[model samples]
Target: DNEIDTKCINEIRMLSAELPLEAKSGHQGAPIGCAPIAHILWSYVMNYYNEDTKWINRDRFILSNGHASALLYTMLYLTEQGLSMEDLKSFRQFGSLTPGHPENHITKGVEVTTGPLGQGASNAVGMAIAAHNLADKYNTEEHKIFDNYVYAICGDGCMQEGVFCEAASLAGHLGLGRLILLYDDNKITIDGNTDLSFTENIEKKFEALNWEVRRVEDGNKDYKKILHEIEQGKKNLQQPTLIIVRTACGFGTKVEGTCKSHGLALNDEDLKNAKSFFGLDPQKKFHISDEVKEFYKNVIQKKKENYIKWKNMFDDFSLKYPQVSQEIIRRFQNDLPNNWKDALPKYTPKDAPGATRNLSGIVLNSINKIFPELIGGSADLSESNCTSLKEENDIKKNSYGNKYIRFGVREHGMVAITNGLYAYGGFKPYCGTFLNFYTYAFGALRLAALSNHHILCIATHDSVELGEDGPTHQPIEVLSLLRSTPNLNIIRPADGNEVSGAYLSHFSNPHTPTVIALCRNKVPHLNNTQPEQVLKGAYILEDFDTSNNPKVILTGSGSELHLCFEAKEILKNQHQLNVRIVSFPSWTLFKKQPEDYQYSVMMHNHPNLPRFYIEPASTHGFDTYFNVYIGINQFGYSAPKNKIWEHLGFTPENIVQKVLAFMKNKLKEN
Candidate 1:
């Protein structure tokens, strides 16, 4: 091995061990054992320039084993990508760029936020798919503008995760030739050896999924062999490649071959011995010789030639293909045409009423033609959820540039894959499934929000209106479930007009992930349904006798909003009580309103009048905005939709009677 290369490897190991030892935090095993993988990629393979980290055509690298953030921070510091020695010393402390895990929002060079085991691997698959789609759409034989690769480094824990299975299978099925996965088969887990739990033949499994698999016999010392296998993985242009490198858990430490080195901090003497074993001065801490830094600068500068060449080529390509160039620029910057929202189909009460899902389909198809970059499919529920696009061709194995995708039955994979599409920066990706199944994909959804990816989740069959599909299909609790998650907007539109409003809001806020929950049953088009009011989050849909001093305020969302309209008439004609009906489509949007706006919507003018909710969903989150909730607290049974709502006391008559009884009691008290 070259002497400079050996010194660089030792420096990475020393820093990886020192940070965890000092902070008494983070996983040290993967960083120490897999330092060679990090060194090889950053020093030789990856095609990212340190200066222009956000260059659209640059290759992406994800540290799926994000616990090994120390290894990444050390490399960034060495290459002058902006981490300082003090930054590493601050380790897992507050107010430092170097967190215990890699968060892309805080760190410049980190591509994705990954801490949970399998999420990084799944995200890599998404990135690879994006690369394929971009190359297909924008690449010409002469230009090759979008030709870039995506690489990920994952450990045994990631492989053991089920999400890896879903994402890896999709990667193989799609034949993502530009995606490379470097598997750190270190054999040890936190509990014990991986053989104690994971005994499947990983190479064969990947081969069965149609991936090209290669092996490096020794990752501890054979740098040439590991580099050769990585090169071989890149050479395969027909399928994604996985190079399994067998390495010791803690490579040069006293507990190198044992499970104890996986997480335990080494003492002063042990650290010195480990440094000495790697032919470095045992007394030196966080040491990198001046010669090594100069060598790294020369290596990185030489690698930067590719970026400079690409930029020059792009300048010429832009002149030749100005229209395509403009489109790419707009997509990368996340800029949309001002009139994109105008493509959404509007409806009135005169039009035939339909399920919100059907209306969502209409709006999606209309917008699909206007925004050519928008692409998505469903988890085998596209037909039932009404998410399939009739005018677009399916994105199959051979057709990578199509607008529609057939994601099969993989719900979790569909969501994660769309995150990658959003990250790739040229496509507006959306995925669909029954609202009840959103729980299966919430992990990916949370990461999408955390990474600030602009994606969509079309969650249909939103309530007990799913009818005979029963308790399993009914998502009565899911509304409050997703409402509790930060940075996620759950929009349950009442009618066709609000469905259009939901899409407008979705496109308006492209950085946040939005889940538009639509009703499976047809809902009545209310009289005062205004599409423009959706962005306000809530608005007064029906104001009955406001000048006559309304005595009651009725509120609901989605399918239940129609009941409020009915109850208003009942209150006015029979009881001679004036009522105001308010449509609450989104809690997140409503909260963004000014205090005065919220006060007006909740009718704070009449504090003495009762305000009540009438949605057939959980009352958990409704307690804050309303005085009383006429919603279900228990699960529903398998029955007709009308019977279920009636049984749950969701009828307008029952609501009127309840309000009358309450008012009578209040009058007696006065």
Candidate 2:
């Protein structure tokens, strides 16, 4: 049995170096240390068959420190399941299969593009959450069909990242028993050694994360110890595991055990000496004995046989659980269940006026009706954030899939685990917190958004109107900051209908994301406005009162929309002029409207250049539309909403005075 693994290992290493070892080129050196770790998992412990690479039950492995890609590439190659020699030869060249870093979608066996310091494993945790959810949803005692593991190999850099610490802490809280990390502690980094920057006890660090930590003292040659540690990790289902294998850098290099063998190419004499150390002919480079190649490739001949055998078992599985099997196939296709949107609630102005947080609750109740795979909860604020779906069950320890996750005030961990849960992927996921605290989860949020995942974020308590809590509770500059995100949508609604509209846009566009900026204070209903207006984003809530050509346009969102509305009275009757009011909830959506609609709205502006943009916020880039803008445009102190608005020139009385000044100025321009 061990002989098969030996052959596989030799072929993998040789083939990985087919071009590199032959030319003394590429990143062939590190795999000598990274190989056995890959083998111990894929060959010895993993249940994946080569043919079914994307099988839902198969364990997912991400190479976090992707510079060591050859370890994974060669293993997959020897198993006759990964990359071909042709792909290996092109390694690091133009259009190489072996680019500098491991890309999840690009490589055959890889699971997320991880060139960054910590996101590969960070994203892998998301993958693990997906696995936990899928297993709970589809696996049964007799079947064990959807169960699998999430494994990643990380170097000192990954361990050093704050993202990893937060992610690990969260994974610990989530009790991700199937998630394992193989610590490749060779003590060397791109800068020579980790001592210059980091030198912490990783075992103690992982233990602090509540992980079951184990170590392999002799990492290079001892496959048995490595395999034993991995098994020990797999056996302990109570907590996530981290197997720290202390390997020497460049294990079988010409300058063995030295950092010189770590990166750059070694000379000819050194290469010959390295081959001699592996008990091979000094003259023969890129050499793998034919016997060794067949031993590892054919070791899985039994597995190929088992694959056909499993077909019958699967046949019985399909026959007994018809509905679940159908769901699994549909899941692989990423198709939504029929009638998923039916449960989503449709709201109108007649609906009771409350915080959009309340509307979030009402929408989620509807979400579960259509999207059964949808699940999530709050970080201890589920009740207040209104993110808890009615009748949904909480996901607890050993429980596979429950729609609600009570994330318990652990904002940082909750977000990372939520990312993992979505990446773990049998369910559509969401996490909740007050709007200001969404800052806590921004790292994980950006990761999910960058990966283009179908996840949700519930950030309530949107503004200073969060009132008595003071400035510490407010998010003043965050609006434009979050708005600047390229693929993310930021919608601050004026009422319940707009809240419902925001969800509709979010659900329909699965690729782009939406962040609903809900108000804690009640938003007065706009009678004539409709949800369809929100689709365009900046819609005409009310036409100009008098003349067709308006002298000024008033623009606002959320609570300020109401303030603008109240100011409309001063501009309309008191000032005796046509003043158009536009509710611009989503700048993104407004920008996307046809040029004609945009020009048509501009048709009723301040008669010359558009004169609008009224809110108690910065007027950055407002010159694109409005020559004159009314906002704080700077920082403020912790104070009452009224005092802050009054001091900041945002009160309705202040708006009227400013507009009167604007009118006199317009006359001067004429």
Candidate 3:
């Protein structure tokens, strides 16, 4: 009855306020305002098992506006999902489970790490896509094994972010009927009323995007209406649903609708007033009444019964269809096929020359036959990035049985969606775009790294060689930025062999996100480049005669490796100076190797030799290993490929001249 629901919602509101007061920090407005919504979701709507957080068919919930983490923590605690009352008291504390922002890895029930604006909402779209795809591929008319809804609660900030717009558009276009978004339409923001910056017709906007939109004018006291709207949203099987619930910024305090309630913890006087308004004892802190506790006990029992019923059905399905059930179980366990690596194609020196992007596509299509979990697409650059799976069909609005996703031109949305796909636990998702455009998706990309999601970002047009596209399209500083990120691997493969190795490196480091930088221009295969050596991160592609004492060491990654090869020929043929060439693909992977391995590859035994590094991008991080950095430190020009290369000092002849001068100066120092 409404009696129990009202008491529990008030209890949730009281706890949400108490958490910030105890921590002496955190946003209070969103949590206080959205308590009733959370109450309905956990107490009645969402189908989840607290005992098994990783249940494959469990409904996925994401808090798009993660500043309201106190609300989420309250729901998890009430549902008995491994969160304790003491954990609630320690909100925002160091090493505590209850942090200011919700992190998927730190929290037992969080589906995705959120707080950076609209990323969580975008991630929900990806999860919905994953759920729909799995259901279509595995479910039979008699046994519905994979049917789960994806839900997200967003705020004014999430609605305004561009990533949300992109994801919403894609979700609507795909007609993801099982996805539902609840908009907490509170008028106030941190900087005063949202009228200061946001005032668009949200219902009309979502309708234009092909979503089924609903509205509730009084969310604070209309529990039945909110529940009715959610049920109605679940019934729409052709389009995603958006329910806009107008709420006060803070529901039960003196500063209820003011911007002051947005982030700061309520003061002692304000907290007392809010507690009294909610029928809670003004003097109590972190208090829960017997009635509320009893209410949740019944709720938990019902949830457990639901879980048991689903388990029984799954058991029956497994007995009836053993082969299909085995595959489903293996996928949910995140296990690769036994002979998955055998599917990777190898290359020889006699292999025809091709751009690394083309070679990467070859490797991807080859592995597609083995890894059924491999699913993704590009951001309107499928043909250019070579990321399209030739044998697969498109995943369209009502046809989700196909594996490929058409992510349009939304780079940020694409990566955020891929993060969701990876979080769904049955897919090794990948996405593609030009190397320079990674800046557009850096927010989502860094979160993928932080969450340890196994995502492959197929970044093409590695450098200024993109040609005629000009400085805007050339990625001068992106490589250095990517190289510095923790737990992220940036591999710039030199040729076909390194391209094959790049995929191996991606699968080997399953918990780390990888960016495989590929060139737009064809490069000849080096005789000594082996797919196995790519795992070492850096290796001596060609060694000099020890008799000459190897006057210098030259290293490069991607397209520039060929220039190192040419420079070695010049130094040996004319200058009578021998040099060793090292193919460096990934700095992150190299750092993980043993010191002896790193030392041998970098030629650290001869500390006095001048080391020169060549690349077509910024030369910021290479100073640790190389004394001379030959790369573009400035913006590129609008010119043809050869002109730009020669104009910037990327030619092999120019590199040899620089090396000769450096060698002459070394002799003088001796």
Candidate 4:
């Protein structure tokens, strides 16, 4: 058994070293050092269907430290997870299945896109949460249908990321006993020894976080000890476990135990020498023994046999619990109830002067009645963001039925956890925080966009009108940052009708993540605000004084929409200038509409009509879409709401004066 296993391990190293060597790039240290862990887990431990990678109940293994992607690709190839030998040979090449990192979309078996260090581990926690919750909802004492363990392999880099610590802390607090973290502790980073910076005791840190921590003394070739530790981790049913395995970087290579094996590709001579060191034929590349191939075939066959048994149990379980079974199937299909949209709270002027943040809570509570999978919470700003639903309870330790997650004060952790929730599928996760604090989770948020993870981000206190909170609390460029990010539907909804529309658009476009930027201050609902119009991104809210054929169009979003309306009235009543008011909610959604529709809303062909965009913060993005931007480019000051508004030149009278001055200059130029 040892001889066969050694040969298999050597084969893995050969592929790992050769791919990067041939491709002339890739991180090699993880694959070479951590091969036994990948091999042992895929071969003897993790249960997966070789035929179908998307089998819902299969145990998930995440490469939190994804630089070691070659190891995973090799495992997929060996296990017949639809990865071909050619795929492995094409490693790190353009348009290849084996990318520089493990991209979930590019590869069949990659569960979540990794390479950002800690996200995969955080995603594993989410998957474990989903598994436990599913089991609680559907599994009977007689039959366990949804139970599955989530394992992740992390390195020094993943441990160093703040996101990982935040997620690990939460996973421990939740007492997610089904999650196991495998630490590949080789002590080598890209910058040489990890001791250059990291010196903390990882075991003590995890123990402090309430995880059951284990250590394996030797991991490179000691599959027995590694397997034993993993089994012990699986047996523990109280806390999530962490298995720290000490491995030598490039276990069988000439550069063993050094950072030299971390990323640099091996030369032809070095490659041959490493193969010779493993007792592999130095002349042959991509070598796999016939006996080892047979061994893999038997491994897959055994797993498939187990898969058939699970399917049989599932068939019987479906008969016993017909409704629950159908719901589970529907969840996998991303299907919702037919009347899911009917729950959005309709609004009238009577709902006027209601803050959009408060209205968001109403819409959330309304829509929550139809879907059981609509689950999320906030980062201690639930009351401020008004994102909590009355029908849901907090997800406490060992309690899986609760629909709300109390994410404490961890903004970065909260969004990453939301990403995990979405990646787990069957759950539409949304989180809340001040609009300004989005910077805290921007990295994880970018990952959500990169992976196309659909979750709602409820960002309240949209602009400087938040007042007295000071410059630090007010957001200026943050909105523009989010607006520029590709695939993220950032909606700054004004009034109750627009808030309802924001919810509708978010739920309808389930595949895209959305940011619903709401206000802390009360703003009256407009009679012209139609719920259907909000999805169009930008719409004509009111046409005041079109008598002169609308010389200027005024546009704004969120809190500034009120200003635009008042400014329109001032321009028409006082200055006798034609003004059309437009509510620009989401630029991303507007761009997605047809050019004709865009032109209609923008009045693009009206060459004489100058469009002036107004907002309480950041003039940067408005410049591209409008002729002039009336907004604050600098940081906000601490003062009362009205004082800040007047000082910032956002008062209706000031807006009228600025427009009159602009018109006079244009008239003089003509």
Q: How do the residues 269-375 of candidate 1 rate in per-residue lDDT, one tens digit apiece?
A: 78899888887888888778787788889867976898899988899899999988998898888888558877878787898889999999999888887787888
Off by over 4 Å in 1: 544-550, 604-607
Model 3 off-target regions past 4 Å? 604-607
Please give the distance, in angstroms, between residue 396's alpha carbon in candidate 2 and its true position after superposition.
2.1
Q: Alpha carbon lDDT of residue 83, candidate 1?
A: 87
lDDT tens readout by residue for model 4, 441-522 = 8888988887888889999988888989889999989878987888889899878889888988887787788999988888
What are the per-residue Cα lDDT tens digits for candidate 3 across 1-670? 5687888988888788778878899988889889889989988898888888998999999999999999999999998998999999999999999999999989999989999999999999999999999999988887778888998999999999998899999999999989999999999878899999999999999999999999888888787888899999989968999999989878878878899888875887788888888777889778888999888878888888988887898899999989878888888888887788887777776978899999999999988887889899999999999999987999998899788999998999999999999998899999999999999999999999998999999999989888888999999999899889998999999998899899999998888999999999889888698778888899998887867444788899898898888888898888888788899998888988999999887866665677889988877877678877688889998889999998888888988998888878878888
- The models' CA-based lDDT, in order, is 0.84, 0.70, 0.89, 0.84
Task: In angstroms, give how far residue 184 of model 1 lies from its true place.
Answer: 1.0
lDDT of 2 by residue, 312-331 (tens): 66677899999878877776
Candidate numbers sorted by lDDT from highest down: 3, 1, 4, 2
Better of 2 and 3 by TM-score: 3
Q: After superposition, which runs of candidate 4 have C-alpha atoms over 4 Å from their true positions?
A: 544-546, 604-607
TM-score of 3: 0.98
- lDDT (C-alpha) at residue 195 in model 3: 94
The C-alpha local distance difference test score for the whole of candidate 3 amounts to 0.89
What is the C-alpha local distance difference test score of candidate 4?
Answer: 0.84
Best by lDDT: 3
